[PDB]
Amino acid sequence: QCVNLTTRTQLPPAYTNSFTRGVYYPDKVFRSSVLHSTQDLFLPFFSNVTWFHAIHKRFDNPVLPFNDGVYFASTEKSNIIRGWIFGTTLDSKTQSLLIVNNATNVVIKVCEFQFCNDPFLDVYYHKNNKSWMKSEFRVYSSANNCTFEYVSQPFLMDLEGKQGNFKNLREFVFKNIDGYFKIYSKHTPINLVRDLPQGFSALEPLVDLPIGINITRFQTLLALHRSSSGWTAGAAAYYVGYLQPRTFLLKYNENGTITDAVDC
């Protein structure tokens, strides 16, 4: 909760450039064999994105401003990331949106949460009988005054620690417009070492959340393990970016999938 980790070490906010990232399907309108010009909140091409990671002596769980919207890209092996928490104060002073996975399903609700300096979901005593079950919950102490509750499709997250290169890529978009929270999700495998791969990806909707609360900040909830100050987190890398009102040319193929995009 309020106790900082022993091995956690601060690092300078290194930056890296994303190439085509920030392209998504604007809305439910389908189009094919046409080139459309969409003006909305986007991630500019070749724009510097923040460089963060979490390992066993550098663990990154800071607070970042949400502004109007943000882009998210990360690669996972043991799926360290549990979810995200959104809100103005990220505390019980007001309402806060929480998108997380408990290893059963994806829980989405808005309540008044007790803020912690270092929220996360920890586990301990693995050794043989790898365990990895929910025991100690450090994200928030209690919740109340819930104005929203939602349950998405079920999923089982495998938190078993893994080694080697990053075999997965997960790119999300988090934005709020006219009191309507929109979220995009794309999951594709990739062979990656560090930095980011070079390629194009078409982001797709995930869920529609007409929440309508003010979000000035957000956190990235991670999972910790030990074989809670002495608990570590597996090797993972995630990136954060800010969206700007930029115009892209979305090229729709015969099947409707976006082949490529260009920033004017």
Next chain:
Amino acid sequence: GAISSVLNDILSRLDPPEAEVQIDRLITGRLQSLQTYVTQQLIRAAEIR
């Protein structure tokens, strides 16, 4: 048809909604005058060709 022919004058006097009503007569009048110039250029261009 607008109260004044200056854009800064109408914007600093009438409200944004009221100025749009006057600006409509300014743009509508300027469009008819602008299109009239382009239409004459196309006709004059044909005579030159």
Next chain:
Amino acid sequence: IANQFNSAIGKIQDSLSSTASALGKLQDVVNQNAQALNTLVKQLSSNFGAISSVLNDILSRLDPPEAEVQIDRLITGRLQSLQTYVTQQLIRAAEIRASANLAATKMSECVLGQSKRVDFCGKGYHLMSFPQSAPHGVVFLHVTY
């Protein structure tokens, strides 16, 4: 004179098949018509200052007297937009009719007859012209000395 002509016609086939830009004169006619029609349709989506560009929306939302005010704005702009299209077509109609008259003059002088005009039937002394059909136009093969 046979080895020159037969070889010349061979160059027309090779140049015509290899070079697709020589016909841009005709492709421009199709482009101008396509752009004018595309723009003419896209103007219907604009609201023209009205609360909404859809008639059914203002009828099902605004009051009867409020809709009439909005219908006037939509009709006014849509009318002007259609006047612009017609105005442009009549002007372009004078350009195509002018080019058609030139094709008729060359057809009679260069093809049907033999003209002594300088560089009207093409560089050099004109001998004979063979017309060829092309979409929305005509092609002339001028044999010169």
Next chain:
Amino acid sequence: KNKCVNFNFNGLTGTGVLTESNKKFLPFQQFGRDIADTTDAVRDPQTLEILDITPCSFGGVSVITPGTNTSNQVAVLYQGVNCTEVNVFQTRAGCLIGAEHVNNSYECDIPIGAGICASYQT
């Protein structure tokens, strides 16, 4: 299906012919549109199908008749549409009713289109 109707799908309305096509929409995109920003297709909100929306048939109506002193005979011609309502024949220009088809070729008198002309004769 296959009829001119006034359709209301979710919050979308319009008049046109509903014909199921082979188009495949993105599962998260229910309604499609053409290059002109006008819906060319839709996905049934209930059943899984893709309905191509074709606006109902319409076109100009032309009257083919000889001079008043010649005769009062009339032949109606439709533009850009085949014979629907309805000597009922079809041409490339559209449905032509009230005239007889003659294979023999004659000099054009009343122009119609697509290399077809009409005249008042035996």
Next chain:
Amino acid sequence: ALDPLSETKCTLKSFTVEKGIYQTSNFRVQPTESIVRFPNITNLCPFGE
């Protein structure tokens, strides 16, 4: 509206129709019936309970 010949006379504003073809009207197909398709009623609150 009596006959298509009269439509030609009214279109020309004269009783004398010269040999030729003229456009007297525009044909349009009207809708046969209204169609309404809305999604399922799923996600119901059990008020019966």
Next chain:
Amino acid sequence: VSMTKTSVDCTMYICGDSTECSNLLLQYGSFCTQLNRALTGIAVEQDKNTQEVFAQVKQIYKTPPIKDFGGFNFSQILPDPSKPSKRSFIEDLLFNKVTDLICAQKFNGLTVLPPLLTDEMIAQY
């Protein structure tokens, strides 16, 4: 020579499927009528361009069955009867290099009128 034939309906283009919109359109007088007659006249003139250009003769001329011109090969410029649609070898390329779309516009409210003179008849001229 020829330009695309288009016929626009000022009643349908301005007011889609609207009775009230069409009633208020009558207050503007002949603006609608003029815009329809204007495009109608152009479509008629576009056909005149083909009559004053393509066909210069009232008779049909044919080549002899035996071709000896003295060593000149006109086969490329002349029509090939083996083709399904009569055209020469030069016209075959002219047709491929120069470029349904017209049907979609017809239903969108912009009518594409077919030309009076077909392309096949142009090849015969």
Next chain:
Amino acid sequence: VSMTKTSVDCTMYICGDSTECSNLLLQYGSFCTQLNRALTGIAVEQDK
């Protein structure tokens, strides 16, 4: 032979020094974007 080439800007001419005024011009669609190509075509014909 050649006519004086003049390129008029419907964005600068219509609304001087006004962001709000220019906002109303977007409601008219291509009217501004269309007039720009009409004058540009005349300038190209002057060189030919």
